[PDB]
């Protein structure tokens, strides 16, 4: 296999406006079919990116920041990857349409599914309003991330690496001194497979695939034989014996993460999707499902001249490879100090949710299920409802709601909200054999509360198998036609993916 940690992390540049004033920020980026080396000892790799780049640029913005983004199509009018056309039923073959995930957004620069455009905005799907998107950005600091969400189509053009960071900057936040500049870095991590010469390998169908199946097929889920962090595989850092702040990204299509130093060192957690934890969090290991963000410190103060490696214990699809798969990046200490560092890690970080007391207006009862469609392959679903069935999750915008989560399923399923960020409530295990047959719910045991992790602001969150999650969500500020779906992308698009209407009654 590739020789882990030969080349040197990327830090994507930050995006520079096309034009700027005191009342609006202005940026431009178009998607491109370009080549990099993904690695030391391959050829260079024929990929899709944002300004023709793998990950796209990095975008900073402040709180309040009146920014607009032109999001353009200028790829191939054919993919390279394999479509299964038997999953959505003139259309251009390539449609794309950018979504800034953990975006308070107006519902036509969300970049709904259906909201899609072919090159140069030639055609666009039923749901397109406009070009340039609007982010108004009040909402709290943190790490958000664009990608692609085009209907049927968002686990290849995300695989293809139409992926970028998205960085909140609230002025506010500045007093508290945490890393920044240099010492500030987003990790956006993407694992991918990877044939001898250098071409992206992503499945035509499952291994050994039943001729009742069409091909391509799309597949249930989708593991990568190799971990990249920003564009490279199994890369180094090298970092100065100092605190440093890392906004960790999961932008891969189904592998989840449960990552540690395998020096047995500590992160502090100062963040979520959501932004700062009212508290910062001392932590060994964490998991990190698709869409997760983790805003975290390391101090590697102690740690001069070391080698440590970012170590994960998760599988995907079997047991984690300790030559491969096991290995996420490595970072070397051994950096001079530029300037001492002046850095804090505070522990009292922001305002506890648990401070607001909405009224519940609402509790929303929800299954993880499915069914069988007529080539064997399974179609998960969100109440056993299609995507293009009518819409049933219709929040009044102002009010709170609780979402009740079922899982019966064998597996867990990263939940992901637009628009808004919630509260975890708790999390309790039921009788599925119960449940399966008689539709009764019979819990095997008491209510959960969520671990520190948790007691911020969420916007994706792990449903686990046997198990029902609450969550408690503010619907706003704005009303319009939004979506909620599971983020393993092979189920995205396949079909667990629902409208989700804030209505202004
Ligand atoms: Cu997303
Ligand atoms: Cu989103
Ligand atoms: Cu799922
Ligand atoms: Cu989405």
Same mark, same amino acid.
């Given at each position: 296999?590739?020789?882990?940690?030969?080349?040197?992390?990327?830090?994507?540049?930050?995006?520079?406006?096309?034009?700027?004033?005191?009342?609006?920020?202005?940026?431009?980026?178009?998607?491109?079919?370009?080549?990099?080396?993904?690695?030391?000892?391959?050829?260079? *790799? #024929? %990929?899709?990116? @944002?300004? /023709? $780049?793998?990950?796209?640029?990095? &975008?900073?913005?402040?709180?309040?920041?009146?920014?607009?983004?032109?999001?353009?199509?200028?790829?191939?009018?054919?993919?390279?990857?394999?479509?299964?056309?038997?999953?959505?039923?003139?259309?251009?073959?390539?449609?794309?349409?950018?979504?800034?995930?953990?975006?308070?957004?107006?519902?036509?620069?969300?970049?709904?599914?259906?909201?899609?455009?072919?090159?140069?905005?030639?055609?666009?799907?039923?749901?397109?309003?406009?070009?340039?998107?609007?982010?108004?950005?009040?909402?709290?600091?943190?790490?958000?991330?664009?990608?692609?969400?085009?209907?049927?189509? *968002? #686990? %290849?053009?995300? @695989?293809? /690496? $139409?992926?970028?960071?998205?960085? &909140?900057?609230?002025?506010?936040?500045?007093?508290?001194?945490?890393?920044?500049?240099?010492?500030?870095?987003?990790?956006?991590?993407?694992?991918?497979?990877?044939?001898?010469?250098?071409?992206?390998?992503?499945?035509?169908?499952?291994?050994?695939?039943?001729?009742?199946?069409?091909?391509?097929?799309?597949?249930?889920?989708?593991?990568?034989?190799?971990?990249?962090?920003?564009?490279?595989?199994?890369?180094?850092?090298?970092?100065?014996?100092?605190?440093?702040?890392?906004?960790?990204?999961?932008?891969?299509?189904?592998?989840?993460?449960?990552?540690?130093?395998?020096?047995?060192?500590?992160?502090?957690?100062?963040?979520?999707?959501?932004?700062?934890?009212?508290?910062?969090?001392?932590?060994?290991?964490?998991?990190?499902?698709?869409?997760?963000?983790?805003?975290?410190?390391?101090?590697?103060?102690?740690?001069?001249?070391?080698?440590?490696?970012?170590?994960?214990?998760?599988?995907?699809?079997?047991?984690?490879?300790?030559?491969?798969?096991?290995?996420?990046?490595?970072?070397?200490?051994?950096?001079?100090?530029?300037?001492?560092?002046?850095?804090?890690?505070?522990?009292?970080?922001?305002?506890?949710?648990?401070?607001?007391?909405?009224?519940?207006?609402?509790?929303?009862?929800?299954?993880?299920?499915?069914?069988?469609?007529?080539?064997?392959?399974?179609?998960?679903?969100?109440?056993?409802?299609?995507?293009?069935?009518?819409?049933?999750?219709?929040?009044?915008?102002?009010?709170?709601?609780?979402?009740?989560?079922?899982?019966?399923?064998?597996?867990?399923?990263?939940?992901?909200?637009?628009?808004?960020?919630?509260?975890?409530?708790?999390?309790?295990?039921?009788?599925?054999?119960?449940?399966?047959?008689?539709?009764?719910?019979?819990?095997?045991?008491?209510?959960?509360?969520?671990?520190?992790?948790?007691?911020?602001?969420?916007?994706?969150?792990?449903?686990?198998?046997?198990?029902?999650?609450?969550?408690?969500?503010?619907?706003?500020?704005?009303?319009?036609?939004?979506?909620?779906?599971?983020?393993?992308?092979?189920?995205?698009?396949?079909?667990?993916?629902?409208?989700?209407?804030?209505?202004?009654?």
């Amino acid at each position: 296999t590739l020789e882990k940690f030969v080349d040197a992390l990327p830090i994507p540049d930050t995006l520079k406006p096309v034009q700027q004033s005191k009342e609006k920020t202005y940026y431009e980026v178009t998607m491109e079919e370009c080549t990099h080396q993904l690695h030391r000892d391959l050829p260079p *790799t #024929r %990929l899709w990116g @944002y300004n /023709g $780049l793998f990950p796209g640029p990095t &975008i900073e913005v402040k709180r309040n920041e009146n920014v607009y983004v032109k999001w353009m199509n200028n790829l191939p009018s054919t993919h390279f990857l394999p479509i299964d056309h038997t999953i959505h039923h003139e259309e251009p073959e390539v449609k794309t349409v950018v979504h800034l995930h953990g975006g308070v957004t107006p519902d036509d620069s969300d970049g709904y599914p259906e909201a899609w455009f072919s090159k140069d905005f030639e055609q666009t799907g039923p749901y397109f309003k406009r070009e340039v998107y609007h982010y108004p950005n009040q909402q709290r600091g943190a790490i958000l991330w664009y990608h692609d969400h085009a209907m049927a189509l *968002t #686990r %290849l053009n995300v @695989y293809a /690496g $139409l992926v970028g960071a998205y960085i &909140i900057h609230d002025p506010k936040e500045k007093r508290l001194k945490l890393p920044s500049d240099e010492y500030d870095v987003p990790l956006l991590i993407t694992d991918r497979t990877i044939n001898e010469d250098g071409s992206l390998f992503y499945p035509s169908a499952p291994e050994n695939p039943s001729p009742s199946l069409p091909n391509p097929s799309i597949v249930p889920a989708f593991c990568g034989e190799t971990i990249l962090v920003n564009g490279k595989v199994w890369p180094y850092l090298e970092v100065e014996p100092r605190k440093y702040r890392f906004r960790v990204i999961n932008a891969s299509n189904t592998r989840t993460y449960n990552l540690s130093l395998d020096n047995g060192g500590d992160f502090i957690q100062i963040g979520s999707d959501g932004g700062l934890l009212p508290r910062s969090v001392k932590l060994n290991s964490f998991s990190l499902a698709p869409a997760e963000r983790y805003d975290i410190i390391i101090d590697f103060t102690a740690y001069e001249g070391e080698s440590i490696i970012l170590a994960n214990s998760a599988g995907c699809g079997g047991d984690v490879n300790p030559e491969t798969d096991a290995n996420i990046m490595q970072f070397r200490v051994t950096k001079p100090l530029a300037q001492k560092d002046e850095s804090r890690k505070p522990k009292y970080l922001a305002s506890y949710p648990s401070v607001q007391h909405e009224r519940i207006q609402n509790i929303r009862t929800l299954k993880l299920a499915g069914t069988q469609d007529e080539y064997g392959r399974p179609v998960l679903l969100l109440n056993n409802k299609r995507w293009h069935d009518p819409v049933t999750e219709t929040p009044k915008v102002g009010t709170t709601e609780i979402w009740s989560i079922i899982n019966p399923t064998r597996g867990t399923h990263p939940i992901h909200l637009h628009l808004v960020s919630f509260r975890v409530l708790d999390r309790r295990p039921f009788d599925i054999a119960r449940y399966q047959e008689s539709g009764e719910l019979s819990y095997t045991g008491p209510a959960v509360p969520p671990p520190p992790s948790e007691k911020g602001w969420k916007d994706t969150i792990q449903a686990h198998a046997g198990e029902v999650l609450r969550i408690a969500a503010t619907f706003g500020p704005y009303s319009g036609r939004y979506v909620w779906h599971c983020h393993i992308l092979e189920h995205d698009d396949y079909d667990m993916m629902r409208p989700m209407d804030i209505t202004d009654p």
